[PDB]
Write a protein that binds this ligand. Structure first.
Ligand code: NLX
Ligand code: NLX
Ligand code: NLX
Ligand code: NAG
Ligand code: NAG
Ligand code: NAG
Ligand code: NAG
Lengths: 531, 532, 531
């Protein structure tokens, strides 16, 4: 009969689902609430504990996904989902739910490691349900937990002061971790060993939680898949007031004072705010006006509660969580996904340095490279061959290095120097679950490490023997690290700790170790921005 | 040295004299004259009506609003097409049926110059008349240039497929405007016996429509369709339209009980509301999710029974159109950079392999209308010859272009020809200096690249070579001559062969010389493939 | 480098403004929150502590003024302002701020006397920003604090029971005094010597705080200028339910229960409420209807928290916590300003016994004189002369005595008989800063003392030496009082204590003691009022 777990707030009811090659069925709990629904007055304020219930809560229905662009959410979800068919989602502000996938034997009393996944999506789109944690849970025998946090205006609108500090979405993730620290045992998970991991916005968040005091003791290992707290685009530095006003005004609200804007914004309907989010055209590159005045998304800010100062200023202080940290990236972070999902101006694969300098400028909101520095940057990259077909491919590398590549290593380095176990990797593979509209040449595009990490090859039909092999290995590494803080294991290519040798593991069809990841680009960029 | 005041049928109007360099005869210009009663409230979704006459002197010295459309989407298109040194930022309004007039005629003496009436493009979803300044062309060719606006998007094209909201509103505004010119143009020095309508893309398809419309009879005399015709698969919606109307009704939060109900409901929605519905529909962008066949990129022309009595195909199939000089033309790379860029096309890698090729061609159903089974065969008839990754991408755009504009144009042209009416074709191949910076030097003859010549931008915008300047001068001369004799050929100009049985046309560009059989082989393959 | 102070709730960044003849520049702090913005839920409820902030609250721009009729607000700020230029302001419900002008050297420890100013405006309009405390703070070297409090419907609506007690404005004022107790120390001010002062409705408020247990230890010196707790127009005795019903009906609300009205009004927008204020056409003499019903102001009430009994009853009981109270009036309280701004039907400058009687009756809301007694009052005042000119002057004297004259003196005497130090004055002077439309014949009009108390001669242009002297003297008198409970000091004419001799100071061109101020008046009115 159905699994029933007794949590602090009440009894939850799930469902048993076994996986091929596994006698033990995983116990799936869909839609467990960890916070009071963030409605009306609770909008733009930290999350509050959830109220308890009297009987047995039926946790077997996919919770709604946090309000967001309905078409963006769906497209993105179809792309990264590791399921056979993408599960259609309903929008709601009442979306602080998390899903539990546990292989543990609920009759006895186990303590399996807990891996908490924070989806990516730009703090704008994304859903937890997009990722099914059956395969990973079954194969590596760990308790997977997919959590949701507030997105867009709802989760990151800030006035720069006490009237609306911001990072509501992040305080949610903290609340989520805190909920796991209190109830996970009930599901066979060991609260003493929680690993947080995510990609893109998820990775950036993981990185932010390593830096925040509100997160200490809530996790013991961290993995950052293609995204950190130095990916400038997601982190809002300097005065944010203008952006709050731009939104307030668009939502049709006065801007007399901070208290007034936030008060007028809580009055808007979910529908209303969505229409503003739509008018704002986030997650899309503006081709008119000054790129500096453009703002693709509402992200993390230095509220003074979660983050007490710029990540950069923090790392320098060596003041943060010195827990095992695994940072990684993919060979072509700007391969096709991001650009295709941001309406990037690129059709002809022919790209001249002139036209190249123009986009690099229009890309300001992504790369943030002062105009008078564009020529030196474009040169160091496209100055190679006179091949206009090779320049655009190199141009794409330029973006990737700035947005993800360089930031990652810098984080990796400082964490390293902070006296803690560090790990790095470079994912270079091309899954057959990639969209048809994706060129066969793009290998290691954004989010390609997801299918391996989440055992897509056991949930989807059609994988190759190679892919299947890759996934197992990747899931193996991730799990080991989840319990030891060291990915190394038997029958797995040795993964070098990231020390002064700067050794990482090149994960791909062929997975060997290497050294000096992006050594030159780091130096090159660290210099130019220091100009 | 006092301002030019002209008396129209509905009252006096007051413009301003402006002179272009090198021209002694100044140009009298009028901005925002109303050619119809503002289509507000009850007038939404209904034929345009005569403007209300005024008592004193109307100030026609300021630019008029552009019809409600995607603000960001319209301004963007206006910066990329404007022939002015600095783009004019415009305001949105349902009260948008105005027209700007530029006449080099000496208002004191009784003049009767040819009248060229423009019709802006923009997928019948965006665009404004104030973007195409008409000074240069008037001054340089002594022709009265009129630029007109017309209801766009929902406002100008919503249809329930029956009487309650036939459709074509915008096209009727266009007629209304032509009607206006007839009754008032003489006051501005024009000759209502020589009206040439011309437009680019949506503007061009509109011209080919009017040429096919009875309600346009006796309203224009020469016609020029620049890269867009009545057969451009994507602007003319054949089949049951009811589904679209309902999807739209439903988005604006309206019932679908009856056509009557939907229409009435929508009529009470505020301008803002419809604008939010337009955004939500996310028009003029390629839908990569769902079923490509259900995708609907833009509301367009429909067979209503008032403007169009049968399908464009049927009308030109019989001799049910007007035998007036018609100049049809296309650009070298219609699907070069502009359109794709502006529809969010996925091409980051800039190179495609057969597979991904047939794939995307499918998502492109609304733009090319090719069944899933035909996709493979067509993709090979284009991307097979070579096994080069980027050459396929290039050859892949040709595909779309030939289907969208190339083929249609020739067919529209051949028919007119076979109708006994004088026809003329051309192919613009040239990369203007005023091209978007984000545009690769590799794109030549992209969509609307010919607009900079036609309107003589090299005389308003700065930084142009002797080449460009000479090209604009040649184009304008060709157009104007056409608008004067219905024959572009004139003194000191390459010979432009008439598009008769030998299929001669003009390849315009740095090197401008005649050629024959334009897209003859493309016409064959497609005419063939769409025949199952 | 601008001055930065740490208050209990966070760092504030102000600005240094030097004044002529004085070294130590003044530290000016504008728009400091002393309470959580009374919005939504909080509308019509006690004022609340503000939320602490995280970095440095930059306070170098004037706060909004509590929603009120814009026109009335601005015209008044114009006439009462002591600044070279009148600063236009923004209306907002988010208005609970206060400005500070500290001449202390924040780098060293200081304990200078604190003078809290409560602006007048009939409790319907007014703003703290109107009064620049530069001159006073520097010349007398005291810390001037200008506070704001809710106005009109927002600050004084009540149903005469628990659902909306009323007196929200005064609670805001007491709230500001509490802030000053816990913060001014950080601004060189002594929280053990806080003096409150205000004129008109402000003087009445100070007069109310003086009588309320809620303020017991928030001030140690009080000063009422033209307005006291007995100025009947500003206090609502009896059943207030009819005015709350009228307001609700006009606001478009039902009148089913006290709880219902409150709730419905609490759901209307800021604008919908402002419009109600406008439709009620407050602060204007109601020429139509029964005088007795017209409500020109929405004022103080016997809520039960702030005021436990009527002002009159509270003066009887001789409480054990007392302070030095200064009470003063001007020579022509109802001279020009007030009736000019209330659209008084006194336009032919003349007046006969019959027309006076008619005018007095309509004045019921201001003088509260029964119809049966009008003749006695009217004859007792205009029966002296024979010409309609002097008769009119005497009519403006009747009103003035009923409104401030007698009430004031009754308040002073009771304070005296209670055992605390009392002082009075009658200001007689026509400041050069008067309004062009004010005829030169009016001397000691309402509010004319303001320019002397705030040193307009040191901020505004063209003051004669005599005016400049009068200001220096007034300020010193006010300061000596602020730090002694006695205004006397070296270089100043003598001010006698207001004891059984009823000695008071006559301030003006020529300043000197006198006795029995308004003595006979207080007599004629006390008796007649008991008929
Ligand atoms: C599914 C959405 C498309 N997709 C475009 C590309 C790359 C990335 C991104 C977006 C918008 C602006 C960016 O700068 C940016 O960088 C990435 C990131 O870190 C998280 C969010 C995001 O995954 C998302 C939108
Ligand atoms: C944001 C860009 C503007 N946006 C949408 C307007 C209408 C349309 C268009 C453009 C430029 C020139 C046109 O003639 C034209 O018609 C439309 C079409 O068919 C495809 C491309 C396009 O969707 C795009 C740019
Ligand atoms: C339109 C409002 C009427 N208007 C101007 C009359 C005179 C005065 C006043 C009021 C109410 C009660 C008074 O005692 C009183 O005196 C004046 C003052 O000092 C400030 C406020 C005020 O300007 C206001 C209301
Ligand atoms: C708590 C509750 O709602 N009860 C439901 C029950 O009706 C349903 O049969 C079962 C499976 O669907 O899940 C549970
Ligand atoms: C009523 C109106 O539109 N105002 C116009 C003004 O904009 C213009 O500048 C002026 C002269 O051109 O004539 C008038
Ligand atoms: C009074 C005024 O605003 N001046 C403008 C003038 O600058 C402008 O050139 C003219 C035509 O647009 O309209 C008017
Ligand atoms: C560092 C900073 O933001 N300085 C601002 C200043 O520019 C502004 O004039 C003032 C009032 O708005 O507040 C402060």
């Amino acid at each position: 009969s159905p699994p029933v777990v007794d949590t602090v707030h009440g009894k939850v009811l799930g469902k048993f689902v076994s996986l091929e090659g596994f006698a033990q069925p995983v116990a799936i709990f869909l839609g467990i609430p960890f916070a009071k629904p963030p409605l009306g007055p609770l909008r733009f304020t930290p999350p509050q504990p959830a109220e308890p219930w009297s009987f047995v809560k039926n946790a077997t229905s996919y919770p709604p996904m946090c309000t967001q662009d309905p078409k963006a959410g769906q497209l993105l979800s179809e792309l990264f989902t590791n399921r056979k068919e993408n599960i259609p989602l309903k929008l709601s502000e009442d979306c602080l739910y998390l899903n539990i996938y546990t292989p543990a034997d609920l009759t006895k009393k186990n303590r399996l490691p807990v891996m908490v996944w924070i989806h990516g999506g730009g703090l704008m789109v994304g859903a937890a349900s997009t990722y099914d944690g059956l395969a990973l849970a079954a194969h590596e025998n760990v308790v997977v937990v997919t959590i949701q946090y507030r997105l867009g205006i709802w989760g990151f609108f800030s006035t720069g002061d006490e009237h609306s500090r911001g990072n509501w979405g992040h305080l949610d993730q903290v609340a989520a971790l805190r909920w796991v620290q209190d109830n996970i045992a009930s599901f066979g998970g060991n609260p003493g060993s929680v690993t947080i991991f995510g990609e893109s916005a998820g990775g950036e968040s993981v990185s932010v939680l390593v830096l925040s005091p509100l997160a200490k003791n809530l996790f013991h290992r961290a993995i950052s898949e293609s995204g950190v707290a130095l990916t400038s685009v997601l982190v809002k530095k300097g005065d944010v007031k203008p952006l709050a006003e731009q939104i307030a005004i668009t939502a049709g609200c006065k801007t007399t004072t901070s208290a007034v804007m936030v008060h007028c914004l809580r009055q808007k309907t979910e529908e209303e705010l969505l229409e503003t989010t739509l008018k704002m055209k986030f997650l899309s590159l503006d081709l008119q006006g000054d790129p500096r005045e453009s703002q693709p998304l509402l992200g993390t800010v230095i509220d003074g509660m979660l983050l007490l100062k710029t990540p950069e200023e923090l790392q320098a202080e060596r003041n943060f969580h010195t827990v095992p940290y695994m940072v990684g990236i993919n060979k072509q972070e700007f391969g096709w996904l991001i650009p295709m999902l941001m309406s990037y101006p690129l059709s002809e694969g022919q790209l001249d340095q002139k036209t190249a300098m123009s986009l690099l400028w229009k890309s300001y909101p992504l790369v943030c490279i002062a105009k008078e520095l564009i020529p030196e940057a474009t040169e160091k990259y496209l100055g190679g061959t006179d091949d206009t077909v090779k320049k655009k491919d190199l141009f794409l590398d330029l973006i990737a290095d700035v947005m993800f590549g360089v930031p990652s290593v810098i984080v990796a380095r400082n964490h390293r120097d902070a006296g803690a176990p560090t790990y790095m990797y470079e994912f270079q593979y091309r899954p057959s679950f990639s969209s048809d509209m994706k060129p066969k040449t793009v290998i290691g595009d954004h989010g390609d490490e997801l299918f391996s990490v989440f055992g897509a090859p056991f949930l989807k039909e059609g994988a190759s023997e190679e892919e299947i092999r890759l996934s197992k290995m990747v899931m193996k590494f991730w799990a080991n690290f989840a319990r030891n803080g060291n990915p190394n294991g038997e029958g797995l290519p040795h993964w070098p700790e990231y020390n002064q040798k700067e050794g990482y593991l090149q994960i791909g069809a062929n997975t060997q170790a290497a050294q000096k990841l992006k050594d030159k680009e780091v130096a090159f960029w660290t210099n130019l921005f220091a100009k």
